[PDB]
Every structure is written in structure tokens, then in C-alpha cells.
């Protein structure tokens, strides 16, 4: 969704009409034994809460 709509907005020579018939998110993966996983999850939720996420988005 985001990639296609962003490219369409950039080029504005094509139309995006399909409805969001799926729901998914983007994550970060690592090995099956990682405290980095818990810490980065906490840090990412912190970024969401503070407002850095939509800050870099805009």
C-alpha cells in the first residue's frame, strides 16, 4: 500500500484504485535468542509514543 501510493503521488501520472483487502505491518527480525529483540521493541514503541515516527514520515 504505502509504496504504491507514495510512488503514485510522486509521479501523479497513474491512479491507485484498489481497496485495502489486506492488513499487515513491517517488523524487524533477528536470531531466536536476542535481548536486542525486547529492547528494540521497547525502543520502537517509544518512537511511536513520542512522535518520531510520523515526524520522519512527514
Amino acid at each position: 500500500s504505502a509504496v504504491l501510493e507514495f510512488e503514485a503521488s510522486q509521479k501523479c501520472d497513474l491512479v491507485t484504485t484498489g481497496e485495502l483487502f489486506f492488513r499487515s505491518g513491517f517488523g524487524i527480525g533477528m536470531r531466536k535468542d536476542s535481548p536486542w529483540k525486547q529492547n528494540v521493541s521497547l525502543s520502537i514503541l517509544k518512537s511511536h509514543e513520542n512522535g518520531f515516527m510520523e515526524d520522519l514520515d512527514k
Binding site: 497513474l14 491512479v15 484504485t17 518512537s47
Partner: protein, 44 residues
């Protein structure tokens, strides 16, 4: 990506990667940060 990570050279993936079963039980993920779905693109 995950194949080469399981190979051993890569250690931690950062990419616009979606979430699905087989890779989920084969390797765990973090909390999502960007949300999207599936959509069609077409010319006018």
C-alpha cells in the same frame, strides 16, 4: 534475505519486510512500525 541471514553472514534484518506464518515460526519478529496492505495500481 532471511535465507542468507540463516546462512550466518547477516545478523539482523532491517528492511520493509511483511509478516507471515512460515518465516514467523522459522524466525521471530519485532513489533511493527509501518502499517499497510495490498493494492492495485493502474494508469488512467
Amino acid at each position: 534475505m532471511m535465507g542468507e541471514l540463516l546462512s550466518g553472514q547477516a545478523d539482523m534484518i532491517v528492511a520493509p519486510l511483511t509478516i507471515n506464518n512460515e518465516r514467523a515460526q522459522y524466525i521471530e519478529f519485532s513489533k511493527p512500525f509501518k502499517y499497510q496492505g495490498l493494492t492495485i495500481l493502474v494508469k488512467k
